Design a protein around this nucleic acid. Structure first.
Ligand SMILES: [Mg+2]
Ligand SMILES: [Mg+2]
Ligand SMILES: [Mg+2]
Ligand SMILES: [Mg+2]
Ligand SMILES: [Mg+2]
Ligand SMILES: [Mg+2]
Ligand SMILES: [Mg+2]
Ligand SMILES: [Mg+2]
Ligand SMILES: [Mg+2]
Ligand SMILES: [Mg+2]
Ligand SMILES: [Mg+2]
Ligand SMILES: [Mg+2]
Ligand SMILES: [Mg+2]
Ligand SMILES: [Mg+2]
Ligand SMILES: [Mg+2]
Ligand SMILES: [Mg+2]
Ligand SMILES: [Mg+2]
Ligand SMILES: [Mg+2]
Ligand SMILES: [Mg+2]
Ligand SMILES: [Mg+2]
Ligand SMILES: [Mg+2]
Ligand SMILES: [Mg+2]
Ligand SMILES: [Mg+2]
Ligand SMILES: [Mg+2]
Ligand SMILES: [Mg+2]
Ligand SMILES: [Mg+2]
Lengths: 257, 77, 138, 328, 539, 132, 194, 101, 49
RNA sequence: AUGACCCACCAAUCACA
RNA sequence: UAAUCGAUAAACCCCGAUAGACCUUACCAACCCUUGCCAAUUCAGCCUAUAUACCGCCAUCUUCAGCAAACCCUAAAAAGGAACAAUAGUAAGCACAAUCAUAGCACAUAAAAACGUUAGGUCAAGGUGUAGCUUAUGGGUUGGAAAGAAAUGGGCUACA
């Protein structure tokens, strides 16, 4: 029965069932989750519950300038050691069950409004820590493939700006959400506009534009009247540095347009 | 190397006549036992001791049943 | 620079007995991969030329053993996997050797046998005649 | 990656010294040829793929060629075609076209001076000259190429060579020449042999399909054939096989003039007839003229027959024949 | 013995020790497991049947039967006595061999229990002397009570059983080792038991004359003359003198070698006859021979006889001729101590690379020797090498032998080729102590001077900066030296900084210092900054 | 699709040893044998014994040196002695390495009743042939 | 605390005698071998893997202990053990005229815990009949007696001995068999006249 | 633990069959012989059919040694076809390789 | 002998020399199973109760 | 000629003090 | 029938089996045994359920040529990205290709063939998630497993 056994990697790979056909077509629900815990995490070479102490492993090779002999711990000493290890496991379970807080953008389950933090340094060493990025719209998008059938890409639409009058937006698309985030950041920094700000809070004059089927209408406010706008426009404004504004959008509210 | 096999020599292997001394000389028992003998004569995997133990098991088993042999239609020693 | 002094202590004795003569001594090396047998051949020949042992070397035909198993755990009998084991040979044929020389050359050679190879030693030794046959007649 | 190459050469030289020492040879007269034998003996890997076996070689042969640095420390690219993305190839095209124009000018001046003094060097065909392959060119520019690229270039060289050839022009187009090696299919005649006061006997060895045949033919004899110590009418009862044995002799009209002994092993009857056929044919090439040798080859007398039994395959029946396939 | 990979190769002497000791602790752990659960290791495969790989049986093979369990549990010490007690409880008679074995066990294992066990040895069984006296005269040397042993020598001589060789050995040693104010009364009793042994038909062994020498060692430093006589005595009867004999000879001959150098010549000639021969180191005490045979050459500084001791070592069996690793490193410490100063650099550099990394690793004593060897022969080439080697083996000693190493950097004169060696060697050093290490101003004399012979001022400036940043200063000849190195290339601002930091720290040459910056600022025509300096010092 | 002893292509980040990057059909062509012994040759005996021995050695070694084993073991058998040769990550202090060397060699020597040698080659991190 | 020591290849003298380094059969530590050797299959741009950490070189039986210098030395040390071959015996003719009897004996070496090979028992006895003192009658009677063990073209008599545990036992039994064949070939009996 | 109860059964069987080999042989000598009378042979018959039923060799099965599989075994390695392939395909079986020809 | 292999490597695990990830996996799974409340019934208890 | 219904993408880690 | 299981369009049907009289063996019927293979363990043990939780091995499209990271472009992008007298694409990687094998080439054959598709096949190779049994769905012994109304697949031998 000793030969009958296996490697940890094999056993976990087995138990998790990540590679099955259930995971691929989304043949099972996302609320069902199980994880892999290293079973060597807290163990030391030489340690056993029989309680031995080996000269090279558990205990230092020389004590008081001489060679320590093979010896065994007392019953109660082993009791305490196992108590320690159990409390270590419980500590790691206490660490694992705590979920880190996600700052909520617009709504709790929306990615909209959320910050991605500064885009990544360009190849020349050029660095923007002055820029912030906000997510405007994340969307699961599909395409019908010859082999796989439905094929799910995320595409995100993002905006960056330094608050000093340069902002720009871009869109990015990938199989993985993380990947599209990266892509749209790094791409956004390439299309920047300069937005002229009157006295560095409002716009200069009233604006009305019909872009495709969307009508935006903005009005220039005095100093105290903060940011009364569609939530996306407020996000973008905060990125530009426009602090006082009024805008009503009519017709299609489609985000990219 | 390591195995001399009790310092025996090939004549304590090939020729087993010595242990057939006590056995009926003209009977079918000579036939049978000369076959067993000849078999052991060709057997590499066994020691001298073991062959002799086979021989003796037969001595003892035939001498165990005298009755069936006498009744058999041949008087056998 | 640093040389140990007087480093040699061989122990050899000569018994009065007529050391055994070997008419021919054949050594067959089986191995899996050729190259190792070639290196071994080189080494063996070299070792014999230095002892003045006068040898020949030839190559016996290679044996390939094949067999089949099922490719699947359960049922597709139509699909198989075939495995090989190739055994390659060298033959070192030595002639006109003595007993001692044989024991040395064989000791040296056998120690240095690489791990993936096997060896078979066929010694044909010379004996004049037995005693009881010489020229008595019963 | 330049420091790498330098170091690698240092340690290849140090190493070559070491190796030459253990192998007990003179470090100066050590060649690559010797390095190889030395490793092959020291690290004997049987592996069928020769590229996977142990190698100690000069790092220039081991490592692939590197595009050198393309610009100075200020950022200006050295070569004026840099921004094309292929400098190497388009330079070649540039200079080639330049030489073409040059040729046109010079030859036009010589047209106005009433001189055509040049010749057509465009036939190298006896040298067996060909163009570089795409692979070769790609190695000469240290740059990847496209099929249409290679095509373009070659077409241009053609345009060049089709005009009056200058000296520097001839030399130019001849970097792009290679010579295809020897093409002759003429056989290698067995030297005729004279043995023990006996004159004119030749040897040949046929192999067909598990049958091997060694045939010795005597020119000095009358017509008969002894196969494995018996008469050929006895050993080959079947007409067809006797006709096979007859083929080469009847072809050369030697049918009464030669006396042959044979050793044939393995295979069946027809395979042995085939074997002796081939061997006999190969033996009679010593006695005949060089032209009739070409004839025998063109009759298919001198070629071994490659056709051999195929291996049965698992899951089939006969090496081709498949198990019966049920649709439903 | 050690694993051959670079990671597991021992760097120092301490690492060699801990590594080898570790390996043995592992081997032990294994053997423990085997002998704890033998049934797992029972199943045999090997055809020639190695008996050596079989598990061992430390249990008694019979329980209640006395005559088995006694000897069984004796071969195994306390279970032996539990056994002899369970045999004496059943009224089973214990014979002359029984507690001769239990006695040899009381001598080999094991002050009240010795008296009790001895009392049971004599009272119950009337043991033949040749066993009982053997054990008790051996064990009461260990329990330190030799008198009752002379009483047992009387009781043994009474019964016609002669005292065997080890008796006269142990009692020659007992009458020797016991001396109260009077040595002659002892030595005479010794020569009397030595004559009494010759009369009793017992032939004195080589180890009896050897024991006698060992005894004559510990009392008089001039007791080498009787011992010398003994050294001739054995040579008359045909027994070849042991390396232990010769050792003790070299011990008293050394104690009398320090004031008088003639006994030295006698050790050297005794050794000179000893060394034309191939050894068979078969006696018990022999290590200290090759310890002290070479030890004398280190104090007397005589290299030829050390070449001879080495030719002796490498001859019979080199490996078998030195017992311990400490007593082994003494050998090379002293021997290479001789090789370094006494011989040409051609010889020293040679034996260096052979002995140092390969056999046994450099101590502090062999460290200082290489330093003094390169100062006299003027070798500046081998400094980076010996430093890099001394880094690997010599980590702990570093701080203490550091101040000496660098001192050989001042003594030289430095050409343009050697600049980079100084730069690297010193830079690694000070980068090691500025990242953690009290740092000498000597080291700055060196970086700054070697960088003046290098032609590099800019780094010597930053290094002087890094010492005045260490919250203490060099003496003023170094500050005047870099005042000069910054003056020759016309760098007066760095000179201003240096003499400002100099006048802040009180430096003794301050008259001469102020005079040197006034001179350099009169040479570069910085004079207004010199007057501003006088105005900054007056305030 | 044959799956046997294969390491499938991931997104292209996956580190793969020289061994793992070669499917069984490359044995004796590109990669070589992880064991060597006489048993599988034409006229030879006790193949089965050596196979079981092998399996136990891989398992044993994998458990005795947890986490520090780089690539699969190499087992050379020569004239009754087995030299085990391993690639080991540097994890443990050389104390633990020598302890385990000695412990192992003795233990296995007494188990299999033949002299066992152990040869450790030490490596900074898993040698990487491909992807990564 | 992480320790990395440079390889032995650094401290290696160019002319250092190699057999010093690898006296016995050795695993090939890359650290202790000076020669750069790349083995392994390459990758499309790349080269064969380095000698450090290379598992494939570890698999190779290495002839490094056997480098020809080391052999020359080894053999020259072995010249003392070997004994000379008698002059006159140089040709096979004289071999037979002097020694009639050839005894073939096999010895097998395979790696593993046990030495024991079943095939080792077999002893073969080859003897020319022309080297025997046989009468005409005795020769015919022996030929008929042994049968298949006699080759009529080459006149070489063959005795294959198996049946006993040891090769020495089998040697004795083959010799004995030969003896008895010769003694019982010369005895004429009653039925031989029939 | 043997991997399966079945394997256990088999181990026992091989033990018993080893133990009684001598008896079985000695008796089947009598049984298989034409020379002896039938009256001895019928008694000898009941004799060998008296012996424990798990002592007779035909009741033995060669099983995969690691995995206990009752068939699909290759006698030489005493291995199941599946386990054999699993070892050979990682190249842990010396001198075994895929076969092309 | 599978008993010797299983027994010996079990002990060597308890003496902390050998490390069995398979047995560890089995363990941790089982622990988490007794925690969730489905364990192995003490002998005799399960059916009738 | 015909071929219940139902099938799919809305959750985040590891490591150290 | 008291009396296994698994495969069961292509991609099952001399298939798991390169192998069942007892054994094998999982089934049926009687009987037995309950810390019950192991160093220890309120534990061993389970051919119990789920192949629609899986690893391992595979089948299949397939001798099909595509898959895929990192980028770049598009009066917006769901997605698309070639034109060689070239119009927006570069791309490492894996497949194909090349090499290796079948003892010389060549050809052939073998081998190889990615990503995915069929919740394809297999918890009875072994291992395992989840859920189940524990004086029984576990472990042993003895003996039984029949059979041909009919339908059919693949073979063998034939009809000369
Ligand atoms: Mg919410
Ligand atoms: Mg057919
Ligand atoms: Mg099971
Ligand atoms: Mg069977
Ligand atoms: Mg309908
Ligand atoms: Mg429908
Ligand atoms: Mg089922
Ligand atoms: Mg079904
Ligand atoms: Mg289907
Ligand atoms: Mg049945
Ligand atoms: Mg049954
Ligand atoms: Mg069941
Ligand atoms: Mg499925
Ligand atoms: Mg493609
Ligand atoms: Mg569009
Ligand atoms: Mg695209
Ligand atoms: Mg690509
Ligand atoms: Mg080929
Ligand atoms: Mg092809
Ligand atoms: Mg195929
Ligand atoms: Mg291919
Ligand atoms: Mg299904
Ligand atoms: Mg199914
Ligand atoms: Mg199961
Ligand atoms: Mg039918
Ligand atoms: Mg079929």
């Amino acid at each position: 029965s000793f030969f009958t056994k296996l490697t940890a990697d094999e056993l976990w790979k087995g138990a998790l069932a990540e590679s099955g056909a259930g995971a691929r077509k989304g043949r099972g629900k996302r609320t069902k989750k199980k994880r892999r815990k290293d079973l060597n995490r807290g163990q030391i070479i030489g340690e056993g519950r029989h309680g031995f102490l080996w000269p090279g492993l558990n205990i230092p090779l020389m004590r008081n300038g001489a060679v320590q002999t093979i010896a065994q711990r007392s019953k109660e000493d082993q009791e305490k050691v196992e108590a320690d290890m159990v409390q270590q496991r419980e500590e790691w379970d206490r660490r694992r069950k705590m979920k880190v807080k996600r700052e909520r953008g617009w709504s709790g389950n929306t990615w909209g409004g959320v910050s991605l933090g500064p885009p990544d340094p360009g190849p020349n060493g050029e660095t923007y820590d002055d820029f912030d990025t906000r997510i405007l719209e994340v969307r699961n998008v599909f395409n019908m493939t010859a082999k796989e059938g439905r094929k799910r890409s995320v595409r995100v639409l993002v905006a960056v700006g330094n608050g000093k009058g340069a902002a720009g937006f871009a869109i990015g698309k990938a199989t993985e959400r993380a990947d599209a985030f990266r892509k749209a950041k790094n791409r956004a920094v390439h299309y920047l506009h300069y937005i002229e700000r009157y006295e560095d809070h409002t716009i200069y004059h009233d604006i009305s534009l019909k872009f495709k089927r969307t009508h935006i209408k903005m009005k220039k406010q005095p100093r105290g009247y903060g940011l009364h706008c569609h939530r996306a426009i407020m996000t973008i404004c905060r990125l530009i540095g426009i602090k006082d504004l009024y805008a009503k959008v009519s017709g299609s509210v489609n985000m990219l347009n | 190397a390591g195995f001399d096999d009790d310092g025996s020599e090939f004549h304590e292997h090939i020729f087993l006549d010595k242990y057939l001394q006590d056995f009926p000389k003209q009977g079918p028992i000579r036939h049978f036992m000369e076959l067993v003998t000849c078999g052991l004569s060709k057997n590499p995997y066994l020691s001298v001791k073991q062959k002799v133990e086979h021989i003796e098991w037969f001595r003892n088993y035939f001498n165990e049943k005298r009755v069936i042999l006498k009744e058999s239609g041949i008087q056998l020693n | 620079v640093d040389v140990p002094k007087d480093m040699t202590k061989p122990e050899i004795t000569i018994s009065d007995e007529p050391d055994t003569l070997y008419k021919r001594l054949s050594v067959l090396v089986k191995g899996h991969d050729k190259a190792v047998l070639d290196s071994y051949e080189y080494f063996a020949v070299l070792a014999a030329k230095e002892l003045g042992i006068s040898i020949k070397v030839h190559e016996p035909p290679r044996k390939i053993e094949r067999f089949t198993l099922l490719k699947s755990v359960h049922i597709f009998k139509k699909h198989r996997v075939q495995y090989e084991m190739r055994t390659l040979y060298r033959c070192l044929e030595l002639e006109h050797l003595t007993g001692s020389t044989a024991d040395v050359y064989l000791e040296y050679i056998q120690r240095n046998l690489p791990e993936g190879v096997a060896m078979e030693v066929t010694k044909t030794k010379l004996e004049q005649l037995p005693e009881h046959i010489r020229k008595p007649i019963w | 990656t330049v420091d790498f190459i330098k170091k690698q050469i240092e340690e290849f030289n140090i190493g070559k010294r070491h190796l030459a020492n253990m192998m007990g040879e003179d470090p100066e007269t050590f060649t690559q040829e010797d390095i190889d034998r030395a490793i092959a003996y020291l690290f004997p890997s049987g592996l069928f793929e020769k590229r996977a076996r142990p190698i100690m070689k000069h790092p220039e042969e081991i490592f692939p060629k590197q595009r050198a640095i393309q610009w100075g420390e200020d950022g200006r690219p050295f070569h004026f075609l840099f921004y094309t993305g292929k400098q190497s190839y388009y330079s070649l095209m540039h200079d080639t076209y330049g030489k073409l124009l040059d040729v046109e000018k010079h030859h036009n001046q010589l047209r106005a001076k009433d001189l055509l003094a040049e010749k057509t060097k465009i036939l190298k065909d006896p040298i067996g000259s060909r163009w570089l392959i795409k692979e070769e060119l790609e190695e000469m520019l240290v740059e990847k190429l496209s099929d249409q690229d290679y095509a373009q270039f070659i077409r241009l060289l053609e345009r060049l060579s089709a005009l009056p050839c200058g000296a520097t022009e001839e030399d130019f187009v001849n970097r792009f020449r290679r010579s295809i090696p020897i093409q002759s299919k003429k056989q290698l005649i067995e030297p005729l042999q004279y043995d023990e006061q006996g004159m004119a006997f030749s040897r040949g060895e046929g192999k067909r399909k598990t049958a091997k045949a060694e045939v010795v033919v005597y020119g000095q004899g009358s017509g008969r054939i002894d196969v494995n110590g018996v008469d050929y009418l006895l050993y080959f009862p079947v007409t067809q096989d006797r006709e096979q044995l007859m083929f080469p002799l009847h072809f050369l009209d030697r049918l009464g003039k030669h006396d042959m002994t044979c050793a044939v092993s393995g295979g069946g009857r027809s395979a042995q007839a085939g074997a002796v056929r081939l061997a006999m044919a190969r033996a009679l090439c010593s006695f005949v003229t060089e032209d009739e040798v070409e004839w025998m080859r063109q009759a298919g007398l001198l070629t071994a027959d490659p056709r051999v039994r195929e291996r049965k395959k698992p899951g089939q029946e006969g090496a081709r024949r498949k198990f019966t396939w049920k649709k439903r | 013995v050690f694993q051959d990979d670079p990671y597991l190769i021992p760097t120092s002497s301490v690492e060699s020790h801990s590594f080898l000791l570790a390996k043995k602790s592992g081997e032990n752990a294994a053997k423990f497991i085997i002998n704890s659960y033998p049934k797992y290791f029972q199943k045999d495969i090997a055809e020639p049947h190695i008996p050596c790989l079989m598990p061992e049986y430390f249990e008694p093979q019979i329980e209640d039967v006395s005559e088995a369990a006694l000897q069984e549990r004796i071969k195994l010490x306390x279970x032996x006595x539990x056994x002899x007690x369970x045999x004496x409880x059943x009224x089973x008679x214990x014979x002359x061999x029984x507690x001769x074995x239990x006695x040899x066990x009381x001598x080999x294992x094991x002050t009240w229990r010795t008296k009790n066990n001895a009392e049971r040895i004599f009272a119950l069984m009337p043991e033949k002397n040749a066993h009982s006296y053997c054990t008790m005269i051996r064990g009461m040397v260990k329990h330190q009570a030799p008198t009752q042993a002379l009483n047992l020598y009387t009781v043994l001589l009474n019964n016609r059983l002669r005292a065997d060789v080890y008796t006269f050995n142990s009692l020659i040693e007992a009458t020797a080792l016991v001396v109260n104010e009077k040595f002659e009364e002892k030595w005479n009793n010794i020569l009397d038991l030595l004559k009494q042994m010759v009369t009793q038909n017992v032939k004195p062994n080589l180890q009896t004359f050897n024991t006698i020498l060992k005894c004559l060692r510990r009392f008089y430093a001039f007791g080498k003359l009787p011992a010398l006589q003994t050294l001739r005595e054995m040579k008359a009867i045909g027994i070849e003198p042991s390396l232990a004999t010769y050792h003790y000879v070299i011990q008293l001959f050394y104690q009398h070698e320090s004031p008088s150098k003639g006994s030295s010549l006698i050790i050297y000639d005794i050794m000179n006859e000893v060394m034309g021969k191939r050894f068979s180191p078969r006696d018990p005490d022999d290590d200290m021979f090759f310890q002290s045979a070479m030890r004398v050459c280190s104090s007397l500084r005589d290299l030829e006889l050390a070449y001879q001791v080495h030719g002796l070592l490498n001859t019979g069996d080199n490996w078998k001729l030195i017992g311990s690793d400490h007593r082994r490193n003494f050998y090379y410490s002293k021997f290479f101590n001789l090789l370094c100063f006494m011989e040409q650099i051609d010889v020293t550099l040679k034996w260096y690379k052979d002995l140092i990394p390969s056999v046994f690793f450099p101590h502090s004593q062999t460290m200082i020797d290489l330093l003094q060897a390169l100062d006299v022969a003027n070798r500046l080439d081998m400094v980076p090498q010996i430093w890099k080697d001394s880094k690997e083996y010599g980590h702990t000693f570093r701080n203490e032998l550091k101040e000496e190493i660098l001192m050989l950097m001042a003594r030289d004169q430095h050409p343009p080729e050697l600049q980079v060696a100084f730069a690297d060697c010193a830079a690694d050093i000070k980068s090691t102590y500025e990242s953690q290490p009290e740092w000498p101003a000597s080291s700055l004399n060196y970086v700054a001077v070697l960088f003046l012979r290098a032609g590099r001022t800019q780094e010597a400036w930053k290094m002087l900066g890094l010492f005045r940043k260490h919250n203490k200063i060099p003496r003023a000849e170094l500050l005047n030296e870099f005042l000069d190195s910054a003056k020759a290339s016309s760098s007066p601002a760095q000179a201003i900084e240096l003499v400002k930091l100099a006048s802040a720290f009180s430096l003794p040459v301050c008259e001469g210092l102020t005079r040197r910056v006034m001179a350099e600022f009169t040479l570069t025509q910085e004079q207004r900054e010199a007057l501003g300096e006088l105005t900054a010092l007056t305030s | 699709k044959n799956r046997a002893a294969r390491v499938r292509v991931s997104k292209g980040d996956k580190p793969v040893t020289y061994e793992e990057a070669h499917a069984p059909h490359y044995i004796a062509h590109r990669k070589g044998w992880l064991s060597l012994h006489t048993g599988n040759l034409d006229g030879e005996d006790h193949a089965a014994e050596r196979t079981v021995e092998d399996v136990f050695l891989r398992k044993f070694m994998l458990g005795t040196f947890p986490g520090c084993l780089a690539d699969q073991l190499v087992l050379k058998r020569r004239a009754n002695q087995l030299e085990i040769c391993a690639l080991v990550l540097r994890q443990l202090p050389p104390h633990k390495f020598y302890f385990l060397v000695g412990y192992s060699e003795t233990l296995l020597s007494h188990f299999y009743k033949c002299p066992v040698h152990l040869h450790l080659q030490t490596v900074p991190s898993k040698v990487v042939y491909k992807y990564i | 605390r992480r320790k990395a020591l440079p390889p032995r290849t650094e401290k290696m003298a160019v002319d250092q005698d190699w057999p010093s380094v690898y006296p016995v059969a050795a695993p090939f530590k890359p650290s202790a071998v000076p020669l750069p050797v790349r083995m392994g299959y390459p990758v499309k741009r790349g080269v064969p893997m380095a000698k450090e950490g290379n598992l494939e070189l570890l698999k190779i039986p290495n002839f490094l202990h056997l480098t020809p210098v080391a052999i020359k030395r080894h053999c020259e040390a072995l010249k003392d053990f070997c004994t000379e071959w008698p002059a006159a015996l140089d040709s096979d003719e004289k071999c037979e005229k002097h020694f009639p009897i050839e005894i073939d004996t096999a010895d097998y070496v395979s790696a593993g815990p046990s030495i024991r090979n079943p095939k080792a028992r077999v002893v073969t006895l080859r003897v020319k009949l022309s080297s025997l003192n046989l009468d005409d009658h005795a020769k015919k009677k022996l030929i008929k007696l042994v049968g298949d063990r006699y080759c009529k073209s080459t006149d070489v008599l063959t005795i294959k001995t198996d049946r006993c545990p040891l090769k020495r036992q089998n040697y004795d039994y083959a010799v004995y068999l030969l003896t008895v064949l010769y003694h019982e070939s010369w005895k004429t009996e009653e039925w031989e006249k029939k | 633990y043997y991997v399966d109860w079945k394997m256990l059964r088999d181990v026992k069987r091989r033990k018993m069959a080893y133990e009684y080999a001598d008896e079985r042989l000695r008796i089947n000598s009598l049984r298989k012989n034409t020379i002896l009378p039938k009256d001895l042979q019928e008694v000898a018959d009941e004799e060998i059919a008296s012996l424990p039923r798990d002592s007779c060799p035909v009741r033995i099965r060669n099983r995969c040694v690691m995995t206990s599989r009752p068939r699909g075994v290759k006698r030489r390695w005493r291995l199941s076809r599946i386990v054999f392939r699993h070892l050979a395909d990682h190249g842990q079986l010396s001198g075994v390789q895929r076969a092309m020809w | 002998n599978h008993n010797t292999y299983f027994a010996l490597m079990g002990t060597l695990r308890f003496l902390g020399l050998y490390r069995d990830e398979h047995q560890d996996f089995r363990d941790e799974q089982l622990r988490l199973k007794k925690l969730r409340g489905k364990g192995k019934p003490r002998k005799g208890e399960g059916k009738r109760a």
